[PDB]
């Protein structure tokens, strides 16, 4: 879906306490825009995007009041999951939820999402039809049965098709230029000696946004799949990203190609002195 909204929610049970730690993170097109954390000095949903700062105190109060209800929901659901899995209170357990919507090219609902995980594994997800559930294993069947028998999916369907699409439209309007915004990478090639009659040439991509990028290597214009080593895309911590790709090659005659949506055209690079 061209545009999306998600809420990533976590409840971690704290041994000894009646209350678990609850964290909720909102995203628009995978960029964080709001956050709630029950561990805060003043537990409240807070803006995490500048364009969100335009929202009034009735908005934050409402969202915070929701997070309070979610905190109780996850507290009870954690307690019940101990029973389904025959666990004791003495340990720490994790309940996660991902939910929201994707908008199509016509800005209409493409599809709604509602997924749950217990202990880092799929537990229960709402199907694309927004009425049927997929349970991951046998324990998850107890919840699926309790949810079919109460018709729980209807209430989620309504949020997903209504409020979700409504607020996503608002956030895209209020967030305007920052969504489509890009930063071109700054490419350079480093030279490192490897062994005898061989060298390692590393092609760095730095200061780019968004995180999507493609670095490749060529010898007389030919692609190199398995014989090329890279790192996973890593944040610089300033909002930009980094990535590198290297080839172990016997002692120019070697080119690197940088592909980023922020570039006017691809970048082609080679070793300096």
């Amino acid at each position: 879906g061209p545009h999306s909204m998600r809420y990533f929610e976590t409840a971690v049970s704290r041994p000894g306490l009646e209350e678990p730690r609850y964290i909720s993170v909102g995203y628009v097109d995978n960029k964080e825009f709001v956050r709630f954390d029950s561990d805060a000095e003043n537990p409240r949903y807070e803006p995490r995007a500048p364009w969100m700062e335009q929202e009034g105190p009735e908005y934050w109060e409402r969202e915070t009041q929701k997070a309070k209800g979610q905190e109780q929901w996850f507290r009870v659901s954690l307690r019940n999951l101990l029973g389904y899995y025959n666990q004791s209170a003495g340990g720490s357990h994790t309940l996660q939820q991902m939910s929201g919507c994707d908008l199509g090219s016509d800005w209409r609902l493409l599809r709604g999402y509602l997924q749950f995980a217990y202990e880092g594994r799929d537990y229960i997800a709402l199907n694309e039809d927004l009425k049927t559930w997929t349970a991951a294993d046998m324990a998850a069947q107890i919840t699926r049965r309790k949810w079919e028998q109460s018709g729980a999916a209807e209430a989620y369907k309504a949020y997903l098709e209504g409020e979700c699409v409504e607020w996503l439209h608002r956030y895209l309007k209020n967030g305007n230029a920052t969504l489509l915004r890009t930063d071109s990478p700054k490419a350079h090639v480093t030279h490192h000696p490897r062994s005898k009659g061989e060298v390692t040439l590393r092609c760095w991509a730095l200061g780019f946004y968004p995180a999507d990028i493609t670095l490749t290597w060529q010898l007389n214009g030919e692609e190199l799949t398995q014989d090329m080593e890279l790192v996973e895309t890593r944040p610089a911590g300033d909002g930009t990203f980094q990535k590198w790709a290297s080839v172990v090659v016997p002692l120019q005659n070697y080119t690197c190609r940088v592909y980023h949506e922020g570039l006017p055209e691809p970048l082609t690079l080679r070793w300096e002195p």
């Binding site: 909720s24 709001v34 949903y45 969202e63 749950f116 607020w167």
Partner: peptide, 9 residues
């Protein structure tokens, strides 16, 4: 805007 879950697990 976030949603509030219904029936517990």
């Amino acid at each position: 805007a976030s949603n509030e879950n219904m029936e517990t697990m």
